[PDB]
């Protein structure tokens, strides 16, 4: 009896941290036509309905949203999808030509003076020996003067040739589910006050993650998930100011963005089967694009985030909000895509407040660009075709990306500024509750068994 | 109602249960192990790697004389050095994760002992078959 012997068990429920290649799944409804979408993937298998989520009682797991894999994989997959959706489209090599530009004083407002240029240029036709004189409207951010006459060129012409986005392909994000392959499991942290790292007392195993929409934006997380109980402040090292602070709201803040210009699209034949979609005359008045948020709602949300930040920086601390220090237009502005148009909004009014220890709306102007450098890459630029009519979109601000300034000693004041630029933080805000583990089905334990001779 | 037992019968449903109780749901994990351009290449590589891992595990089990069995009793006696813990403690209090953490140090020693025991048993079978 006291003589115990080794018994071998296969299929034991034990696992370890591991990295693998998850396979994406998309909702079946997405397969109803609408194949023209950047994120529409044929690889993504149909979503298994009535998903099953098994709760692992008494199991405590260690999570780390900052060293987490399955965020780098998501970044890579999104970038690859973006490139794949751009391969078949037109390369705008002929567009790198001298332009004779002039201002559009055609019922513009004082804030839109010089923002639009009326540029005329010679272009190749479908016949190699013929040329056409055409004109288009270009945003001042897309053309740079070259030096009487005033000649311009596209900003990208000394770096690379831009690929025109296919007009039928949509930029609207669609939910994507990441699923574990054979021999692997995805563990979900069900704790509602989880700060992204450390043990998670409440754990469950899921076949696939919740549908995560690949929303690309800076300084403001849009259309994401909301904290269930309180505003969550998450940082790899809160004391270290070099680390971005990810803020998750418990209630959304509605943001209304519009491009009030009635744009007109114009097709120009660049070559055999090649079309360049230019911008024709704007029908009506020319006015600045802008976004609106409720003043009271934003103030309440800022008060809440300040309340949660004081838990990390002391009660009697002055918390200040300031606009971006500087950098490229992508990071210093709230960048996002609104119905196929790319916005660059000046959020200086959203982050203008100092908080003491004790029906109006905020209109923040926005600028439009058509030459897009996504994923912080250089040499791969995309030209966004113009969109006819008036653009309008409504979104939820579900979080922030903040950066703290290095203060000398303890100056009883902390100033936070909006950040972003690295989309891995955007995915990280949705995958913080997930991890991938590898099953280890082989187990040896003492049992009072003995084999024959 | 379906009942909470179906959860116990789900994948990793017994991960938190006592190893004695988790020993009755081995087949779930065992079957999950075989569940079924660059994206296609990566998916194919993952599938091939999973197949290779499963085959390596099966080859190990066969090398221990445990081929085709999910629970296999052996001839290797249990060393008190590996764990002086009682039987009731192990099979009614701990879970497989805790037990794996405890005995992770001696796993290779146990594997080598199992291999040696199977080799000795095979040659003893062959020698008794040298006698019959």
């Amino acid at each position, epitope marked *: 009896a006291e003589n115990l012997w080794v018994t071998v068990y296969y299929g034991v429920p034990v696992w370890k941290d591991a990295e693998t290649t998850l396979f994406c799944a998309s909702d079946a409804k997405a397969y109803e036509t609408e194949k023209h979408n950047v994120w529409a993937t044929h690889a993504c298998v149909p979503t298994d309905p*009535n998903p*099953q989520e098994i*709760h692992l*009682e008494n199991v405590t797991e260690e999570f780390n949203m900052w060293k987490n894999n399955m965020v780098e994989q998501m970044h890579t997959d999104i970038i690859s999808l973006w490139d794949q959706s751009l391969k078949p489209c037109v390369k705008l090599t002929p567009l790198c030509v001298t332009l004779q530009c002039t201002n559009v004083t055609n019922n513009i407002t004082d804030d839109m003076r010089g923002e639009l240029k009326n540029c005329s240029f010679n272009m190749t036709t479908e016949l190699r020996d013929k040329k056409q004189k055409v004109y288009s409207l270009f945003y001042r951010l897309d053309v740079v003067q070259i030096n009487s006459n005033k000649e311009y060129r596209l900003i990208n012409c000394n770096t690379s040739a831009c690929t025109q986005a296919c007009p039928k392909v949509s930029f609207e994000p669609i939910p994507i589910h990441y699923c574990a392959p054979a021999g692997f499991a995805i563990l979900k942290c*069900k704790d509602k006050k989880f700060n992204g790292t450390g043990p998670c007392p*409440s754990v469950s195993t899921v076949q696939c993650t919740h549908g995560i929409k690949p929303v690309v934006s800076t300084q403001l997380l849009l259309n994401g998930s909301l904290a269930e109980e309180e505003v969550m402040i998450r940082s790899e090292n809160i004391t270290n100011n070099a680390k971005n602070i990810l803020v998750q709201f418990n209630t959304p803040v509605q943001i209304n963005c519009t491009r009030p210009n009635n744009n007109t699209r114009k097709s120009i034949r660049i070559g055999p089967g090649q079309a360049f979609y230019a911008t024709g005359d704007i029908i009506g008045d020319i006015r600045q694009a802008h976004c609106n948020v409720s003043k009271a709602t934003w103030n309440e949300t800022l008060g809440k985030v300040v309340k949660q930040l004081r838990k990390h920086f002391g009660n009697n601390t002055i918390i200040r909000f300031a606009n971006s220090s500087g950098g490229d237009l992508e990071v210093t502005t709230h960048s996002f895509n609104c119905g196929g148009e790319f916005f660059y909004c000046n959020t200086s009014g959203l982050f203008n407040s100092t908080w003491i220890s004790n029906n109006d709306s905020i209109t923040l102007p926005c600028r439009i660009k058509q030459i897009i450098n996504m994923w912080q890459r250089i040499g791969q630029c995309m030209y966004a075709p113009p969109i006819q009519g008036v653009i309008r979109c409504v979104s939820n601000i579900t979080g922030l990306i903040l950066t703290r300034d290095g203060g000398s000693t303890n100056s009883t004041t902390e100033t936070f500024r909006p950040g972003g630029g690295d989309m891995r933080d955007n995915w990280r805000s949705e995958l913080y509750k997930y991890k991938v583990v590898k099953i280890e089905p082989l187990g040896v334990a003492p049992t009072r068994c003995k084999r024959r001779v | *109602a*379906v*009942g*909470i*037992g*179906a*959860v*116990f019968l789900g994948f990793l449903g*017994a991960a938190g*249960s*006592t190893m004695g*109780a988790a020993s*009755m749901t081995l087949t779930v994990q065992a079957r999950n192990l075989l569940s079924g351009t660059v994206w296609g290449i990566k998916q194919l590589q993952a599938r091939v790697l999973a197949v290779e891992r499963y085959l390596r595990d099966q080859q190990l089990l066969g090398i221990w004389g445990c081929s085709g069995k999910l629970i296999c009793c052996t001839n290797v006696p249990w060393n008190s050095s590996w764990s002086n813990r009682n039987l009731s403690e192990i099979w009614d209090n701990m879970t497989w994760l805790q037990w794996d953490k405890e005995i992770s140090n001696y796993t290779q020693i146990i594997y080598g002992l199992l291999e040696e025991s199977q080799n000795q048993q095979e040659k003893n079978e062959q020698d008794l078959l040298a006698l019959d």
Partner: antibody, heavy 118, light 113 residues
Framework: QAQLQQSGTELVRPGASVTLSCKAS????????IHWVKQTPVHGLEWIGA????????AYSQKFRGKALLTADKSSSTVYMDLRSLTSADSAVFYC???????????WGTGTTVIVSS | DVLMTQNPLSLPVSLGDQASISCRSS???????????LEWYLQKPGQSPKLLIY???NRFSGVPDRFSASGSGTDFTLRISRVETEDLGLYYC?????????FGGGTKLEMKR
């Protein structure tokens, strides 16, 4: 004669732990799994947990996870709840009920009115 | 997670009439096996809850033909015909597919004199 018997009334002080019981008789204990539901007029009927006597698997709900501790004895065919850190909100009637896989709560208990008072 | 909404809170009815109880689920209740485990339970004053219908369509055990339930997915309804004095009590709808299970808000049947 499948019946479930539980204690009638237990009066204890707040911050203490009470041990209830649910005697299973007249039917094979193993086959069915015993569930518990509280009967309160403010929060309504809620499910606490359910045990399978065979494997001892204990399933809980997040609304009463933690303090609720459920144990069973196969020999005596008994299922107990050990509820700790009792407050006024815990005073209600607890029904112990049996269930089968893909079955139904065919038979229930008589209830157990618990009062938390010093 | 599975919110079980039951309406109306009170359902007055005269003896011999028909009373209808509506109970709506927040999400789908159909399990992977294909069956929907939604049950209706009745609690009399001073008595423990009693099962009436299981599977939302099948009768528990020779319960009256008066007690008939129907519905699908989000919407489920229990109908009681020829109301009798013994039918007084609280009716509760309950789903048993997704853990944790939840009970209905409760409908108080009231007989009329």
């Amino acid at each position: 004669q499948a019946q479930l018997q539980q204690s009638g009334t237990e009066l204890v002080r707040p911050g203490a732990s009470v041990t209830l019981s649910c005697k299973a008789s007249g039917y094979k204990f193993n086959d069915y799994e015993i569930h518990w539901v509280k009967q309160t007029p403010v929060h309504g009927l809620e499910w606490i947990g359910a045990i399978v006597p065979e494997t001892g698997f204990t399933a809980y709900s997040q609304k009463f996870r933690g303090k609720a501790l459920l144990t069973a004895d196969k020999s005596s065919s008994t299922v107990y709840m050990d509820l700790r850190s009792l407050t006024s909100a815990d005073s209600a009637v607890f029904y112990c009920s049996r269930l089968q896989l893909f079955g139904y709560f065919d038979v229930w208990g008589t209830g157990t009115t618990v009062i938390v008072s010093s | 997670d599975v919110l079980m909404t039951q309406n109306p809170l009170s359902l007055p009815v005269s003896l011999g009439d028909q009373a209808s109880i509506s109970c709506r689920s927040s999400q789908s209740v159909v399990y992977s096996d294909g069956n929907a485990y939604l049950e209706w339970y009745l609690q009399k004053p001073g008595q423990s809850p009693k099962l009436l219908i299981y599977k939302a369509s099948n009768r528990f055990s020779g319960v009256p033909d008066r007690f008939s339930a129907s519905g699908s997915g989000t919407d489920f309804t229990l109908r009681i015909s020829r109301v009798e004095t013994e039918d007084l009590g609280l009716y509760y709808c309950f789903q048993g597919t997704h853990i944790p299970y939840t009970f209905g808000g409760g409908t108080k049947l009231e007989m009329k004199r």
